Amino acid sequence: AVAKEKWTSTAIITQPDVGQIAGYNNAMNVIYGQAAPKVSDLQETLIGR
Amino acid sequence: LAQYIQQVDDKVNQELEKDLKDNIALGRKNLQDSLRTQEVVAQEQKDL
């Protein structure tokens, strides 16, 4: 009757879709040209950040 | 079980037709722009 209780929530997140960051990926293909990172490498950075 | 397989399959299939429509309608915007900046270059050559 004095002990406070503890409820646990849970969400599961994942690296964004290839079409969600297609505006941001086109920004990195214009300013960098041929040395731009791949879109499968721009997803491990945005979930690394 | 055959309902819960089709339940996840109708969640993935609707999270990809929604994803492709946000990639095509944005992919034809970075091409309608890239035909406008490639046409002003083609008039800097014409003005020369």
Token pair belonging to A25:
């990926």
Please, which experimental method was used?
A: cryo-EM
**How far is the CA of A23 from the CAs of A7, A13, B35, B44, in angstroms?**
39, 21, 17, 28
How big is chain A by its Cα radius of gyration, in Å? 19
Alpha-carbon distance of B23 to B18, in angstroms, equals 9
Q: Does the beta carbon of B13 lie under 8 angstroms from any beta carbon of chain A?
A: no
To test the contact with chain A by mutation, choose from B18, B22, B24 the residue with the greatest count of A C-beta atoms within 10 A, namely B22
| A23: chain B residues, CB-CB within 8 Å | 26
Residues 6+ apart with CB under 8 A from B23: A18, A19, A22
Name residue A7's amino acid: W
Residues in chain A: 49
Alpha-carbon distance of A48 to B18, in angstroms, equals 25
H/E stretch holding A11 reads none
| A26: chain B residues, CB-CB within 8 Å | 26, 30
